[model samples]
Target chain A: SGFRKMAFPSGKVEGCMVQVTCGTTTLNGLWLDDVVYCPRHVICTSEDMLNPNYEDLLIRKSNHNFLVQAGNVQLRVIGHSMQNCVLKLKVDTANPKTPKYKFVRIQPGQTFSVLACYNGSPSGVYQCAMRPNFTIKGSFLNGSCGSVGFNIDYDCVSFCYMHHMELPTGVHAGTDLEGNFYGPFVDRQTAQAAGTDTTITVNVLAWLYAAVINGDRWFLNRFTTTLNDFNLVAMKYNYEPLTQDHVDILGPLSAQTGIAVLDMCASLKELLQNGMNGRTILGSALLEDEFTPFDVVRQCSGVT
Target chain B: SGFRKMAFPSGKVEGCMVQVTCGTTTLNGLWLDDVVYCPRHVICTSEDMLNPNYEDLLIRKSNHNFLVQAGNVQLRVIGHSMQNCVLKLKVDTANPKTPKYKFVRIQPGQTFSVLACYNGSPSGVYQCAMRPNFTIKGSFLNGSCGSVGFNIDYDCVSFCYMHHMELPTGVHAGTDLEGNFYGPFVDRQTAQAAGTDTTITVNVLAWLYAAVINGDRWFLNRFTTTLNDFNLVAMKYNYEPLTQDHVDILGPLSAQTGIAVLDMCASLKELLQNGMNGRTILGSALLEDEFTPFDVVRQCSGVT
Candidate 1:
């Protein structure tokens, strides 16, 4: 496993506040909305917000265990699939005794995954524990969990935490028939257990059909020095997370078209599990197959 | 499987000219003193020489087989190991149907097995038979099997016959330490039926190791060509086969020096019924640990 750090730059802003951006060459993937900082060291974001004091700072609850805080932050770390990793947060450097840090487990050969932790605290150090063969402890820190995003470099796989941000904003696109997509392989086991084929649709689940577009703009955010600096890149790149906008555009486009996206993910996952590269296989199939000429779009819009 | 062709520039040789070369490219082990061409189009080589014609070429008798003839003379071909290949004989351009040619089977990857064939009347037009995932076969004509040398180009995997005169000569080396060299798994089903351990001794069976080296060499030869002509890089680099000289030098040196060649193949077969690359685990141990190395090597060597 390798070691990584987060840094905050210290400077005074207008009024009575000081602008602090943890500045560590080791720091990576820090973006404007990805992370947030507060003077009291109160932190909130991802599942780790349940870390006692941090949970108190949730500005509004998305209800899925994820809460938005004044300083809620997400950082996009980009790299080819890494075998094992140690995620460290460098929130405070002045004092080392009371280092506030936690550890996240990562798998090998997984193109991408996300780790969520706070950006600031009186004690500024957090790290993930290490394991062999990519086995991760499902829940650590007293059952409080954080989602792990995988294959972001391709189609990302994520673990769920207390965050219930999963808003049922869309229905099954399969009904419309305009562009209905069928998954190559249904989650037979899950479907059988639940006695429902739609127990978990490919569109909502983690699979290979999703595109991995950690674009130049996404990486550029990691290089920004401050929130303002990050916002500049964000605006310059015209990047925004497609939350409601995605649903609006895709919602009425017929279940065939909308649900097909999820079906592609399912099919891609099946291919990958069978020892095929999903990206290459799907790209070739979609363009050549008379039935589909779909374009690849990152699973998560504006994701690094 | 693929095809290959070998042409001998020997012009014409007398007697069943003996070939001690390990074939060209030195990737596979030496052929030792094998008879590729014998009198009456019946080329006897190795233990296979004892078998009668026609019936001897059956799958059980010779897993890899070939047919050949020269003018009014017929040629019987037999060897150890052939697979994934095609044999394209460059016939005497002067004569079309009554062409003189050579044929040999090669095991693709590392399939080191035995092959045999019978002689027929007036063998003509030695052409290789192609089989996917299987060795190739070819026929030779005339009594010129021994007289005509072959030029072999390993164009593909399966069959590629070469005139012994065109083949290169060299020694291929191998280690047979008890735990590491040979394997952890053996075809227990077959060995158990045979009643004996079937653990072949290294010194007496050193020839068998040569077969494996030959197979390996064939792979390297094609790989090198692909790299040079097609700019296709092989996963591994070419290696020279171990020579009889290596055994001679290393055999005596083992007495004075601690370094002794371990016949892992033999030892591994003794431990298990079938064979597998896993036996390398044990053979490797001997190389690292010296305390019981000699005893382990001696026991595993199955030295007769």
Candidate 2:
């Protein structure tokens, strides 16, 4: 017989028992009448479930849909099912009496992008849902039937990149009611893998895009002022300051998409030069009516 | 022993017993035994005291300090107690370094209203409280102290009607910390007795007043647009539509000192508008608005 008592993480003792038997035989191959005896003892310990990391794993599994990032103003729809669906976008305006709506049809495995505007008003509440239109029988995949609203300046970017992809239910947190998540998770993941240095760049581009599309002059002005302040802070901290060079590098990428890249780039360079050197340099640049440093960089890089 | 067994909602039986005896009588009365055995028995059912409505009442009692509409760009001080009190209004702005404040001295039974603007900015956060200013006894009554902030549209309306008048605690919900309820309950009750239909008109006027004094152009524009839409919806549903004439009729009412009479009148007109043209029109009105006609009637009737 082998018996052992082990202490569990919860301070409880558990007994595990096993039994073995042996028979003794005579010297010259005689008959062996068995004599049974307890021969061995063993000790064992149970797995500890009290570890912090294990607790985190439990919680992560429990709350599957987690928010990665919030606050984007752009939305892109992709249909994964092998059936055509009609996407309906409803705009809930400040007035409840009248609701604005638009519908677009998308083929299976196709991606469609639309600016989130309602009745020419960029700042409003919106909801998007997709359903099979024709004789299709399948249901909408992830990224269907969600609502977003924009009220303030930052809401422009914050409402954009949500519920763009499909994943297994209960894998990520912040899944919509239809068991779908927002955003192009794959693109986001790829961008994230590029490293943390690109985070600021991505965010600035998003802010710029949101401002440009919304035609929010106040937001554009604030963005330029904020970037200038960021540059100053980076310079003070001896970090790599954003310059006309980076703008030139990224400007063409936006221009290729037919966005207002040149105007935004010019504004950014003006603000940055005003902050970096002195007011006199900015004044001289404006007075001369010549290309600013941003123009020079873009021309040198052959981006235009 | 007078003992009784009772069944409770918790599914447990409890025994309650009491003792009783009888004695021999003289003269014309017959003799009675002092019965040693148990002589008295009683059957009782426990009081439920656990109805869902009763539970709601308990909750409503517990959360007393509910918010009232408070969006006043101005504040009024009324001293009910014999104590002369100094009312302090502190205006907190986005820039924390400089906070704007005003202090007014109020005599007992005196009412005073002051501009809510601070540092020439009508749009800011404000708080008002009363304290003993110059050796006066007593405290503020009903609407003594509150905090309100304005960042978006309609907040002005929401902040204005808060804690308008005092109620003997526990009637309506959203009482203040000082155990006082908001709104002109008596007037609201009077208007309700008059009938429904004036609800929208009352609300629109409230919205208009809030926007007008605050000079919130955005809110005024939105209100006008919303009213226009309401008119369209009413016409489409074959109900009596609100016209610019109605706006003209109600606009000056808001400019008046007394708000109740005008409010009641507007509400009455609205209800009459719904009721005059047969129930079918009201039904259609409700259906088009996504609410049942009865619901619209009830809402207009001021049931809530």
Candidate 3:
């Protein structure tokens, strides 16, 4: 037996990398911008499953053709490249052979929606849904088509839930071709008259997600330690307030293109409300050609 | 109308009652339990439209065949025998002439949903589609069926949001034949770890909405100004949390038969999560025969 009682036991592995239950051993890696310490085994397994809390953070497919995780509890996938991803959910952990988790599949522009509070069921089934049942979308295995910059979005309807959205922002809730957005179900003076706040407030510890540049669509972001009142400004419409998380992720991606994250998310929300029906967030179209090979110059902080 | 200088101008009439932009003069009415000062007009009009909000307080429809306000922001017609009811919505007073305002056709045992925040439109549509598109399912209108309760629910899809729901009072998130309600998406212990301090603490507003009864299913409750970390002791599941937003608008027409609102909501949340493809909720499914035309004592506080 050589020196250190081998950090981890002899192990079989597959998919992405995971923390070895053994010791502080890591694989050689540098896909992230920071001097990331990768103390993990190159595998995503049952051992990777943590309590239903969102224990995992910022996952990228890097160059893995496929990536998998033990389970999801408010999971998020970023910068995956044509990666195929899988998660274990809605099934029995005890039996290990059960697979009836029943809700998953993905697509963009679907009239997808999410209830912001606990959907009354603690176990969280009613908390989420999709057409013909529920489905998990991309950015997991191989999402984000061409752009190299990290495209982040939160995936919690199936996991922890991206908690926060909005009531009509301002009085002009619709949009005009000058590139304005409107037609929101305006709030009521009566809701106030009755002394109940119908609008949802952003708790300081709020868990919200939004993003850009992944498999197909643009990307997303999740504000964790930001200040308290970061209401989803951009969501209700195009001129939403944009802040740090926007800069942390989008600046890295959009700076090269000279677009703003606010405009970016605003458009994303508009298109989503429009049901994306194969349309776009751009009030006008952009250049896959204008940016020349659009996929080039993506890494926001210049990694990969 | 004789001495007050004809309060309201020569305004046309419509369904139910509404505010008279003129003076305070309520029509003679005594169907409610309280003197409920009737200072409004006797017709609901485009003017009845204030704003689109999920508002609340207390209301009693009494014997009024055309009652206007109900707790439902999204409405439904449950118990009434075949009388077709219409819930007026999106009556943009700013443009009452616009046809965007429509009367929602009420249906029984049918599921309806709404995108709450935005309905993919700008004049901000308060549109409704069958089943859970985004909200709850309870607030309902009246008519004459057997003795039955109203059904209210919510269906909204907003970003930055957290929703609410129900479950059985036992160890199962699923239903057992004792007709036990369980099978919840059992919340995780790690809700604390993942940053959801699942503990309903002091000063924290634990909006617990449980149902019991008044004129319908064990009515309902929204514990806002109420507290006690009793979440660990009470109603973890004894029909779970029975509550009290249960003052009946028409309970005077439903008190004698329906049992408790608690059992009803408990059952519904159970059915809901089972992918309730389609099911139900009821407090007292009794006495059309037992009470021998049990239609006799139908008053929660006494209305019709």
lDDT of 3 at A213: 25
The weakest ten consecutive residues by lDDT in model 1 chain B span: B166-175
How far is each candidate from the true structure, as Cα RMSD in Å? Answer: 28.8, 34.8, 27.3
Give each prediction's DockQ, rounded to 2 decimals.
Answer: 0.01, 0.01, 0.01
- TM-score-wise, the better of 2 and 3 is 2
Query: Interface Cα RMSD for all candidates?
Result: 33.3, 36.4, 32.1
Write the candidate numbers in order of decreasing TM-score. 2, 3, 1
Write down the lDDT of every candidate, Cα atoms only: 0.21, 0.22, 0.19
How many angstroms is residue B298 displaced in model 2 relative to the true structure, after the best TM-score fit?
25
lDDT by residue (A193-285, candidate 3, tens digit) is 111111111110011111122222342323122222233532343222434643454344455444454444444444334433433221112
Candidate 2 Cα lDDT to native? 0.22
Pick by lDDT: 2 or 3, better one: 2
What's model 1's lDDT at B69? 37
- Per-residue accuracy of model 1 over A1-304 as CA lDDT, tens digit each: 0001111110000000112222211111211212312211112323432332423333332222222212233322221111112112222222211112222223221222123222221101111111112222111111111122212121122211110111121111000011111112111111111112211121221212222221111101111133343334324433222233333333322242333332333332343234222223221221111110111122122111
- For model 1 chain A, give the 10-residue run with minimal summed lDDT: A7-16
Which model, 1 or 3, shows the larger TM-score?
A: 3
Q: Give the lDDT of residue A173 in candidate 1.
A: 9
The C-alpha stretches of model 3 lying farther than 4 A from their native spots are A1-84, A87-304, B1-304
Each candidate's fnat? 0.00, 0.00, 0.00
